[PDB]
Subunit: 138 residues, 4 copies
Amino acid sequence: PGIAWIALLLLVIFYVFAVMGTKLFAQSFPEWFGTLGASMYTLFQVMTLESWSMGIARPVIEAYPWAWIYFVSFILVSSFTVLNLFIGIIIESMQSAHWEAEDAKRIEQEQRAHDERLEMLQLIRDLSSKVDRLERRS
Amino acid sequence: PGIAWIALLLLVIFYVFAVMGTKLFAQSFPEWFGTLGASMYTLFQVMTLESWSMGIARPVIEAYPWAWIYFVSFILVSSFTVLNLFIGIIIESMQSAHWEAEDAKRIEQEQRAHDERLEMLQLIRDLSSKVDRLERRSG
Amino acid sequence: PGIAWIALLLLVIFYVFAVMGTKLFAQSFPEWFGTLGASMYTLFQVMTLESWSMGIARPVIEAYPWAWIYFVSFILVSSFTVLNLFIGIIIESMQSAHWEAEDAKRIEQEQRAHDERLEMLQLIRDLSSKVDRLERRS
Amino acid sequence: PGIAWIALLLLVIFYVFAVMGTKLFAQSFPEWFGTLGASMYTLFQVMTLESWSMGIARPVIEAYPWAWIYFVSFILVSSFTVLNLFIGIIIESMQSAHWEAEDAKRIEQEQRAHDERLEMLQLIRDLSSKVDRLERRS
Ligand SMILES: [Br-]
Ligand SMILES: [Br-]
């Protein structure tokens, strides 16, 4: 029903990496990826882009050469998601603030003007046969 | 009076978490939370996402193993709430640029054409009256 | 010329403060604030929020327990500003692809509507004034 | 063709600084700029502002005291390039959310309108005939 529809995806991506991660790293890096609960703190810390490479990534990377793939793919993807959620909430915001509020009038101040043109139509009809019942009564 | 109302909710959160923070951690971390004034600067650093977990929160969590809920809830709450400030501003920014200005130039653009039709609407009724009299005066 | 009126202001504050902190701090921390051009860098990394407190301000604050006003002012101030190039480029951007081309496409559909409405106006007059003429001879 | 047009820019801005970095620091900073990949990563770490100054630039600046150029420039180049891809993505967002329909739904309203306002050019000319034959039938 709107944005929380990626907000689910984000939660899903997240939990996918916490498992992907505890499942490689818990072995040599308990403090970070030991428990599942472990893998999430560490991952939301990565999410905050606070000491992601220097603090967490680089120490794991020298242990597991390929471990960038994980950290980076994760940040790329996980941010590309939040980029949306954000934009989504921008749109979702101004769609309220303005657009809906204004469209309601562009329609209804154009209902008002549609009827205005109708009432002249009728008036010009009625007249128009009076004018040719001066041509039948003359 | 608008978004300025919400930056009161964000000054209350800092306070809720600072008293909460001094009253909790001061004893073992006089560094950060040992007074109020410091437990805010620590909260302002934790808000800027500067070292919040390596420098502050992962040390704290060593001594009280539950304090993550303190920091994860603070980053969330104190972030979501300055998403509102970066939004409501972003909007009442657009609002001045455009909406107020053009929105009013359509109120009037219709106003002016409304009167145009309400003037046409006139003559027409004027003409009817004239044909009507012409009608009666030869029956 | 608009946008860079804030960019010129930001350039200012960067300098206002840069002198500020070379004057106050350059003796106790020559590494960070030694020269002026040394604060120009250091305030650039404070601005991007990289180890600003824990590695710079907290260390200076130990020297001058009131320097936090120097740091917490700059953060707030240079933030609020940095925001408005973003909000400034946003606005001027939307402006390009949409806003400008809309007021034109609309003013001009209203000219036509106006003139169509004008023709009708004169047309009724002449018809009002044939019947004016006809009624006086009747 | 849009934003992946800017996506290549950011990719070719990286590529450049990457080779430039390795051909600059690879002698003294093996772990950071020891190879091309090495630098690509390190720059993503700098690009995400994660620990860039106390960790990379400052300790590098130590050996080449001009290096700030490289780091402070790459920051500004790449972060602006992301502000574009961002914006062109906020706008192409708005477009399909709102501006799409609201511009089509108004052309179709000024169709309705013009037609109505023409419908009565008709009546008003017809009536101007009947009344033109009341003036000659006299
Ligand atoms: Br709009
Ligand atoms: Br009309």
